[PDB]
Design a protein around this ligand. Structure first.
Ligand SMILES: O=C1N=NC(=O)c2cc(OCC3CCCCC3)ccc21
Lengths: 195, 198
């Protein structure tokens, strides 16, 4: 059930597709980044076409839409990483088992590209290049996190196994989200850029 | 995609079904257990019907069936646990983030035993305040495996020059496997819960 805007993959199940500058899709992703990172230079934007990761993510989306009884469970967020982690994320997505983790032992995503653009996250490589993903994240129903969580808290400790979907730094005005399960986040675009 | 022999759950996403001694379904699990645990006695065997865990696991199985040549990717293995963990495993499955360090570590992941006698150790199936021990019977996507190492947080690569193309699982011994370790969510479906006593 591969999305229409994906380009043909000659019957393969993984491809990184470089976007054409000045076309609709590239302009949309560039604008999301330049909202907070207009001082940075974009070398390229690639679309991640990973059929298996997409399948597993879409199953978790359909389940969360049923569980929560509404369809507003997805946000587009940013994730900076080092060059040596890019092949793993492209093929396998995000892994909590692989910086501060003050809101719990999960994978962190930023609302603002400027946060992910810090050298501690998007570490410049031996050529000065920095790497940041644009990510579809199933944030669903969220609560404030805290140090040492291995899953989100329960919604009511009367039923300890009915969990929040994610945690955040601030519930009224979130700037980051943490997810604790595989296939709750789909890396959709990779931005390669310089300071 | 829910199996046609499951009980009708009437819109519900989750149910535990108590099996009847003398049914083939009960007897096969009883025999699999008693092969190595004939000193213990079974109280009851429950079929775990968890729609979401089943969906996510069957998607992973179809993907491993495509990726691997013509491999039998699935084994039926045992997992002992404490009573405090049973409600979470029934609803959410096996979380590597909650796993203990094993007395012989082949990596940081969830451990599954070939023999019920391994899982029947008090270290894993801790007796509760009523002297009941709990063991799951689990469908596990072992796939293509190699001998593990204590340092691992994912299975190792098949080829050191292609670090992202990974083994599916690791074992203690490739020639005579007695334990498997998996490192990803929805690679194991808790199928039956055995409640047993001395
Ligand atoms: O883009 C990111 N890539 N990798 C991260 O680990 C990461 C982490 C992150 O917030 C970490 C949080 C910040 C406030 C204090 C506690 C810790 C935000 C973005 C990122």
């Amino acid at each position: 059930n591969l999305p229409e805007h994906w380009t043909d993959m000659n019957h393969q199940l993984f491809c990184m597709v470089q976007l054409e500058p000045g076309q609709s899709e590239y302009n949309t992703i560039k604008d999301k980044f330049t909202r907070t990172c207009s001082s940075y230079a974009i070398e390229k934007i690639e679309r991640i076409q990973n059929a298996f990761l997409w399948q597993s993510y879409q199953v978790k989306k359909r389940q969360m839409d049923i569980k929560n009884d509404h369809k507003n469970n997805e946000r587009l967020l940013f994730h900076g990483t080092d060059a040596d982690s890019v092949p793993y994320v492209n093929q396998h997505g995000f892994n909590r088992s692989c910086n501060a983790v003050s809101y719990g032992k999960g994978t962190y995503f930023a609302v603002d590209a400027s946060y992910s653009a810090k050298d501690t996250y998007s570490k410049p490589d031996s050529n000065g290049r920095k790497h940041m993903y644009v990510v579809r994240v199933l944030t669903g129903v969220f609560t404030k996190g805290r140090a040492g969580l291995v899953t989100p808290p329960p919604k009511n400790p009367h039923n300890p196994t009915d969990l929040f979907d994610s945690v955040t730094n601030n519930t009224r005005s979130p700037k980051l989200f943490v997810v604790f399960f595989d296939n709750q986040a789909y890396p959709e675009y990779l931005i390669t850029f310089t300071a």
